[PDB]
Amino acid sequence: METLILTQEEVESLISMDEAMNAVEEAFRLYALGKAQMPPKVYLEFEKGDLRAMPAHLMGYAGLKWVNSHPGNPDKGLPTVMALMILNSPETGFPLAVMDATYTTSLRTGAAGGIAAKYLARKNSSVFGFIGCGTQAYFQLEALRRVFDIGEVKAYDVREKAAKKFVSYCEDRGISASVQPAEEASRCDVLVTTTPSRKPVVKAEWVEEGTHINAIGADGPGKQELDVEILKKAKIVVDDLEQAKHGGEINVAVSKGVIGVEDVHATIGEVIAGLKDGRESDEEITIFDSTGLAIQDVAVAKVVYENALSKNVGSKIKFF
């Protein structure tokens, strides 16, 4: 028996943002129809960071992603986030592959952002605002242009160097774009928040009617990027109800009792599956609360694995 070993460089050449988008969309659809299995994430907290286990079964595969988050890592000489995915066969339990999931974690988060805006944002969106111009912002930008012709990009980062680079990246591919303060960047049709802040970075009075917000940054207890008043006034569509409660953009609000569960309109899978309506009026403010789900990592790993067999990419180890 042979287990395929895939490196980050290899995995990067094995999936398309479009492939990632199709896989993530079907994953949401399947989970909402009960055709996917996914236990809650498991945390192992450390003093300098943590590790999380994210197992899932769907589309004919099973797998477990084991990701860490150590902030002091860069100030040290290593990425903050490193992830490994073990892909298995549901019929034999055999470990078909051990791959880098560092890149695909960013990729499939980008893909989800793009799929959520496709279903929730006004069909006429053209102005895209970005609060935070780090790695994830680029992936969100790339997924979104698969679904919208981007008229204008307004970019804000506390690190001006990062906003200018993102702006320059846009122009390079012909997208009109400019660096902008936070209040102005927030004025748009689709607003992508991608910061790891623990206090509001976007004010309610800055958000106009009809805005769709991809709230991506918040993913751990206490993380929070939005003025809670925005939450009260919006149709909130989460990733996974329980993961949003614990660490999504809505965690602080729910914990401090500002909004309840009736305040959550649907999960993105329910909308995609037709179990709940998505955007219903032009005036409403919509929010997609993204936390990252194991079904997205397995779906996407399935594509990397099959494309890997096809191109004879990888190396092999006989573990047993």
Ligand X SMILES: NC(=O)c1ccc[n+]([C@@H]2O[C@H](COP(=O)([O-])OP(=O)(O)OC[C@H]3O[C@@H](n4cnc5c(N)ncnc54)[C@H](O)[C@@H]3O)[C@@H](O)[C@H]2O)c1
Residues tagged active-site? 65
HSE-CB of 142 using CA atoms within 13 angstroms = 20
Residues 248-267 that bind Na ion (CB under 5 A): 249
62 counts as binding its own copies under rule CB under 8 A: yes
125 vs 145: CA distance, rounded Å:
11
Applying CB under 6 A, which of residues 290, 297, 299, 302 lies at the interface with ligand X?
290
Please tell me the number of Cα atoms within 13 Å of 112 on its side-chain side. 32
Site membership for its own copies, residue 106 (CB under 8 A): no
d(CA 266, CA 262): 10
* Residue 196 within binding range of ligand X, rule CB under 6 A: yes
Binding positions are: 108, 135-136, 157-159, 217-219, 223, 290
Spatial separation of the C-alpha atoms in residues 251 and 280, rounded to whole Å:
25
**Which x/- pattern, by CB under 8 A, does the window 38-57 give for its own copies?**
-x--xxxxxxxxxx-x-xxx
Size, binding site for its own copies by CB under 8 A: 48
Site string for ligand X, 94-133 (x = CB under 6 A): -----------xx--x---------------------xxx
Binding its own copies (rule: CB under 8 A), the pick from 35, 76, 173, 199 is 76
* Residues in the annotated binding site for NAD(+): 108, 135-136, 157-159, 217-219, 223, 290
319 and 94 Cβ atoms separated by less than 8 Å: no
Helix/strand number for the chain, H first, E second: 11, 15
What end-to-end distance do the CA atoms of the chain give, in Å? 7
70 lines the binding site for its own copies (CB under 8 A): yes
Q: Token pair for residue 89?
A: 């066969």
